[PDB]
């Protein structure tokens, strides 16, 4: 019937519950990969031209179908077997599926006889498989089945296992292609610049960009000033800018009227006509298409020997290299002329001020490249290489007159290794061409926390380089609403550049625009090639994926028809964006991938199409087959992208904005399912985030990624390099509705703690924390640190090999002061053996060309117990051993602890229960935080959570801290607390533990959810006292793990200079780093040869050995002078 406001809160979260029950949280990752395997791989193979050999017999090869099998592993004996994801992680294998293709070989022998043979399912390489994808072994497995495979059901997948490393492809943000964007450069010579990054359908040969720019008026001249500003075009493969009018002439439009007809659609407008006049004068000399073509060819990529070549080359560039998305055929000149004129027309509007300049920060102008589009780009090159070598291999055999074996022509390494390398290293492209390769695309999945794992799978990477600095890209653009978390973003050089998807935000996987184009032709849309230029003025331009297809004289009806079709899912899929620019008389239809969209409730006549019946059907989501997709089919909820959002009049809530009230907006098109969905995975776990200062919310987002807990249920089976496990994780007493979908209850990353905000002994000042020693003794925030050491014995060389054994101090050459007794006869320590610093866990010896020692030494700080010792064969077939060392981390002084409100703090001191202050009931706070942390930070949500937590614990009900919930108020929480015999404001009378006297001020105390952060003092404490030095500089090593020395940087050097401490500055920079001695000739300041054993010092060059001076200088200074000498310089140290 209709959802009343009293039931709306339940109704909307039922809708949200269904969405996640179906979509999950890594849908964009899985859907993108599914599209790539299912469609892109086949499309790329099909789109490949048949290979033709002629050198006489003629051989043709065509790749018909693509076949993919389950991820398979081959044992050293050659027996295939299914590769479970856990096995790959343990044995450092790559989770890849064999790839097979049907190839048809037809040979023409000039005897009028054709022989055709098909090589069915020809192996052509292996494709890494995204976990839990349609082609993954875990696909379609019930939670029970996953447990039987040692796989966590809560694991969302969406990542690749390359050599056992879980790799996640970060969504790469880029400007939308095929779209005309006009920007103004204040400093550049061009007043305005209209660019369009045109790319082929299905992402063929990479994007080609064309710039149409208007020259700035800065140039002063009698002729330049009078004419005004001229427009030039920067075509690809052309060194110099080409006047725009020349390009139109090269296209086949010579008369000014014809050219102006494609640029100016209404000659009745005189202002626009005057703008193009200077451009016409510039190209007045060229009055023929061939002359225009020759002119362009003159600036071609390579010089043209003759005019005919120049014209041919110029036609080649225009035909395909210019506006390829518009067309790549020889009959597309008219289509490109219209689009090129539109670009000019768009530029004129910007110059005339009639149209606002495009915003680069607008994400309607942005696309996110997911694994699918990412992988497809790689596969196109690898497949082209595969065919290139196939042609090369076949050419050699056909040239000799012998037929060629098709199987032997295929090099499977091309695809198998190329895909693996890009994911393995993250360098995007080719290993040889790493200079232009995009880096950071692939990252090792973060397993610190489940929320951290989830966040890494929903991360977004901005195109701007991290090294470069620019506020605008780092700013929180308005278009980020509902698409990207406004709070989750790293602090430092990456602020505003690395982003995370909003909770319901979805990225379009893309589809073919053919059904839409066919419907448009069927509808009363006039084709661009059939209309006259005069008719464009009144009609509205129709753009499909950035291609101007035609015009329509009834835009309103067409949009309604298009909207009806998409809501009914008849011809238009859900992820298709239909944008009508009423002012600009343009309808833009987008169907490509990378478009960010979120589901929104449809509103008609100020009424939600979502009624009580839909809620009731959803309530029985199971045993009813009613799911979220039914809501989309029902047409009550639809996905809206950023571009379409501009044209959408949206209601924050139906309970208030739809209801009759003071007339503000009587025409609402959509409504939020819930305003809290604008937050991401990490921002969604903040309680009362609408009561905290925004920077705090961001800080918690980062902190939550570092909170200990249970990052995964099957952590025991896993052998990760680092892993932190909390003994007693607790679900927050005060939670948020979104937390149900993050599985935070299933994998909590904190403990609800009795926190008192008081100044007790000054040991919690300045973001420091006082912890309860007795509580810690009971396992409070106690955690495990798991560290895995992997060692491989490999034999490579004529007589060099590595083995696992106990290296005897006499037998082996290399040795250290560590202890080798723990090692077993097989060179591997046993599980359950206590191990401390300077202990050998793996005994590895390499034969000397008797044998050197390459044994693995346990981390000096680490002191744990060998947990697991796994031995197997790695992906290379060599003996492979992984050893897990378990160390228990009891919270100490200095260990970082944070709330869910950005209030991080190390443990300043630990007091026993008797020493801690207590209430009348004997309750002592587990943690005490300084009151001074609250005022400046204004983390009011922290106080509310403490108050709500007190009610939750006493009432026995988990508190709700959904940000925008009018049903929850501090007064409401305070009133509830009064019912339980406590001060309504959460204050209690506390007694000094040392004296037992009542504290004059009553202390704000209550349960608060804190989290132990990965940063532990014992992992950071480092001391150096005459440690090892590096070979190049002979200075203290670098890194805590290397016992390196702290850097005494320039600022420290500068500081001591102000101090005037010359000797200490000398100590730090000379004595404590690299004291060195050199012998220098007195005649020449060059270093002399010194033989202390023979007591002979000579200067080769001065023929003297009697007057040599010993100089005490830093070794680096010696290296500098020596390095300078390498550049022919002569730094002559003179002692006189």
């Amino acid at each position: 019937d209709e959802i009343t406001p009293d039931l709306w809160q339940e109704a909307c979260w039922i809708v949200i519950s269904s969405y996640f029950d179906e979509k999950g949280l890594v849908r964009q990752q899985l859907d993108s990969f599914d599209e790539f395997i299912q469609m892109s791989v086949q499309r790329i193979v099909e789109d490949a031209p048949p290979i033709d050999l002629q050198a006489p017999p003629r051989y043709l090869l065509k790749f018909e179908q693509i076949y993919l099998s389950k991820p398979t592993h081959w044992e050293r004996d050659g027996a295939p077997s299914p590769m479970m994801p856990n096995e790959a992680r343990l044995r450092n294998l790559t989770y890849s599926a064999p790839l097979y293709v049907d190839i048809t070989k037809t040979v023409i022998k000039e005897g009028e006889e054709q022989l055709q043979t098909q090589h069915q399912k020809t192996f052509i390489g292996k494709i890494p498989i995204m976990l839990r994808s349609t082609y993954c072994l875990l696909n379609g497995l019930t939670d029970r089945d996953l447990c039987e495979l040692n796989e966590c059901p809560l694991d969302p997948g969406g990542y690749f296992i390359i050599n056992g490393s879980e790799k996640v492809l970060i969504a790469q943000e880029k400007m939308a292609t095929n779209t005309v964007y006009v920007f103004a450069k204040k400093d550049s010579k061009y007043a305005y610049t209209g660019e369009c990054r045109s790319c082929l359908e299905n992402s063929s040969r990479p994007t080609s960009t064309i710039w149409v720019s208007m020259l700035a008026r800065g140039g002063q001249g009698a002729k330049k000033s009078a004419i005004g500003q001229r427009i030039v075009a920067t075509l690809p493969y052309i060194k110099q800018e080409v006047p725009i009018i020349i390009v139109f002439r090269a296209l086949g439009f010579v008369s000014d009227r014809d050219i102006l007809e494609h640029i100016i659609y209404d000659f009745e407008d005189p202002e626009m006509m005057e703008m193009v006049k200077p451009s016409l004068d510039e190209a007045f000399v060229i009055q023929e298409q061939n002359v225009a073509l020759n002119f362009i060819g003159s600036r071609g990529a390579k010089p043209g020997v003759t005019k005919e070549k120049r014209i041919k080359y110029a036609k080649e560039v225009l035909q395909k290299e210019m506006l390829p998305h518009v067309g790549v055929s020889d009959f597309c000149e008219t289509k490109k002329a219209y689009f090129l004129g539109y670009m000019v027309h768009r530029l004129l509007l910007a110059a005339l001020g009639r149209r606002e300049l495009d915003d680069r920060d607008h994400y309607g102008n942005k696309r996110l490249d997911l694994a699918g589009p990412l992988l497809a780009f790689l596969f196109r090159g690898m497949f082209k290489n595969l065919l290139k070598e196939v042609r090369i291999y076949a050419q050699k055999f056909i040239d000799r007159g012998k037929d060629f074996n098709l199987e032997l022509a295929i090099k499977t390494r091309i695809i198998s290794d190329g895909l693996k390398y890009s994911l393995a290293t993250g360098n995007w492209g080719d290993q040889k061409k790493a200079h232009q390769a995009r880096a950071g695309v692939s990252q090792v999945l973060n397993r610190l926390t489940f929320a951290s794992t989830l966040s890494h799978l929903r991360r977004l990477n901005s195109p701007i380089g991290r090294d470069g600095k620019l506020a605008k890209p780092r700013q929180l653009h308005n278009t980020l609403w509902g698409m990207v978390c406004p709070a989750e973003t790293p602090e430092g050089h990456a602020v505003g550049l690395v982003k995370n998807l909003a909770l319901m935000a979805y990225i379009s996987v893309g589809s073919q625009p053919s059904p839409i184009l066919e419907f448009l032709e069927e509808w009363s849309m006039e084709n661009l090639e059939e209309i006259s230029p005069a008719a464009i003025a009144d009609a509205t331009k129709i753009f499909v994926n950035g291609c101007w297809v035609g015009i329509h004289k009834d835009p309103e009806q067409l949009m309604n028809t298009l909207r009806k079709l998409r809501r009914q899912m008849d011809i238009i899929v859900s992820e298709v964006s239909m944008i009508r620019d009423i002012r600009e008389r343009e309808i833009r239809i987008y169907t490509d991938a990378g478009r960010i969209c979120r589901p929104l409730l449809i509103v008609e006549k100020q009424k939600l199409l979502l009624k009580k019946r839909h809620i009731d059907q959803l309530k029985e989501r199971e045993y009813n087959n009613y799911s979220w997709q039914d809501l989309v089919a029902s047409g009550v909820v639809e996905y809206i992208d950023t571009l379409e959002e501009e044209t959408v009049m949206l209601a924050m809530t139906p309970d208030d904005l739809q209801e009759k009230e003071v007339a503000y907006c009587s025409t609402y098109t959509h409504c939020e399912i819930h305003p809290s969905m604008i937050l991401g995975v990490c921002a969604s776990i903040i309680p009362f985030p609408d009561h905290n200062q925004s920077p705090r919310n961001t800080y918690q987002s980062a902190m939550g990624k570092q909170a200990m807990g249970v990052y995964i249920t099957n952590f025991h089976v896993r052998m990760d390099t680092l892993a932190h496990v909390l003994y007693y994780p607790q679900k927050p007493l005060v939670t948020t509705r979104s937390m149900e979908y993050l599985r935070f209850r299933e994998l909590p990353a904190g403990i609800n703690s009795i926190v008192a905000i008081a100044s007790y002994t000054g040991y919690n000042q300045e973001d420091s924390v006082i912890m309860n020693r007795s509580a810690v003794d009971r396992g409070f925030f106690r955690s495990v640190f798991y560290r895995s050491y992997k060692e491989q014995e490999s034999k490579k060389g004529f007589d060099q090999e590595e083995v696992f054994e106990k290296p005897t101090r006499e037998t082996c050459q290399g040795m250290r002061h560590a202890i080798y007794d723990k090692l077993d006869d097989d060179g591997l320590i046993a599980p359950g053996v206590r191990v401390s610093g300077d202990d050998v866990i793996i005994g590895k010896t390499v034969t000397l060309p008797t044998k050197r020692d390459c044994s693995t030494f346990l981390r000096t700080s680490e002191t744990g117990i060998v947990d697991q010792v796994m031995v197997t064969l790695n992906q290379e077939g060599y003996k492979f051993c992984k050893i897990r060392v378990r160390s228990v981390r009891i919270p100490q002084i200095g260990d970082k602890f944070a709330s869910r409100h950005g209030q991080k703090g190390t443990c300043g001191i630990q007091y026993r229960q008797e020493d801690m202050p207590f209430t009348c009931e004997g309750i002592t706070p587990d943690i005490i935080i300084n009151p001074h942390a609250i005022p400046s930070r204004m983390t009011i949500g922290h106080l509310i959570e403490c108050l709500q937590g007190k009610v939750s614990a006493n009432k026995g009900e988990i508190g709700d801290a959904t940000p925008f919930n009018d049903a929850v108020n501090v007064q409401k929480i305070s009133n509830l607390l009064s019912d339980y015999g406590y001060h309504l404001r959460g204050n209690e009378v506390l007694y000094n533990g040392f004296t037992g006297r009542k504290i004059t001020s009553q202390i704000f105390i209550g349960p608060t959810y804190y989290q132990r952060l990965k940063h532990m003092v014992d992992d950071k404490i480092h001391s150096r006292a005459r440690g090892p030095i590096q070979i190049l500089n002979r200075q203290p090593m670098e890194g805590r793990s290397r016992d390196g020395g702290l850097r005494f940087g320039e600022m420290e050097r500068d500081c001591q200079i102000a101090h005037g401490a010359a000797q200490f500055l000398r100590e730090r920079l000379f004595e404590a780093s690299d004291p060195y001695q050199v012998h220098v000739c007195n005649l020449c300041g060059i270093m002399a040869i010194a033989n202390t054993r023979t007591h002979t010092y000579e200067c080769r060059g001065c023929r003297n050995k009697t007057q040599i001076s010993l100089v005490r200088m830093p070794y680096a200074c010696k290296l500098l002078f020596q390095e300078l000498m390498s550049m022919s310089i002569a730094p002559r140290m003179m002692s006189v």
Binding site: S255, D256, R257, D258, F267, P270, E271, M273, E274, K277, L280, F284, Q287, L352, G353, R354, E356, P555, E556, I582, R583, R585, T647, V648, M649, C665, S666, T667, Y668, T669
Partner: protein, 114 residues
């Protein structure tokens, strides 16, 4: 101010004077065609360029759901109470805060400024 193209090769026609007749003429460069000039004004440059925004407004804007609608400004032509108002937001004006009203009644794209 107007723009003309020669009927011969449809190229831009530029002004030119004939000393013998002392009458303004429009002559095509690449064509040698000539035409009698009737406007007598080569061009007009509008520094202030106070172009009536009402002309630039499109009647279809009434279909925009995001534009505000007011019933206190009835259409002067058809009398329809409901009307949609908005600001120019056109560059080069150097100042724009006045509202431009468009009648919401279909088939009546009347536009006015209060």
């Amino acid at each position: 101010v107007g723009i003309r193209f020669c009927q011969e090769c449809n190229n831009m026609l530029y002004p030119k004077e004939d000393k013998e007749n002392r009458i303004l003429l429009y002559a095509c460069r690449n064509c040698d065609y000539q035409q009698e000039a009737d406007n007598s004004c080569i061009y007009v440059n509008k520094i202030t360029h106070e172009v009536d925004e009402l002309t630039q407004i499109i009647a279809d804007v009434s279909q925009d759901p995001t534009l505000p609608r007011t019933e206190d400004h009835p259409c002067q032509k058809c009398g329809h109470k409901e009307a949609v108002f908005f600001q120019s937001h056109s560059a080069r004006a150097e100042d724009a805060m006045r509202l431009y009203y468009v009648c919401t009644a279909p088939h009546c794209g009347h536009r006015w400024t209060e």
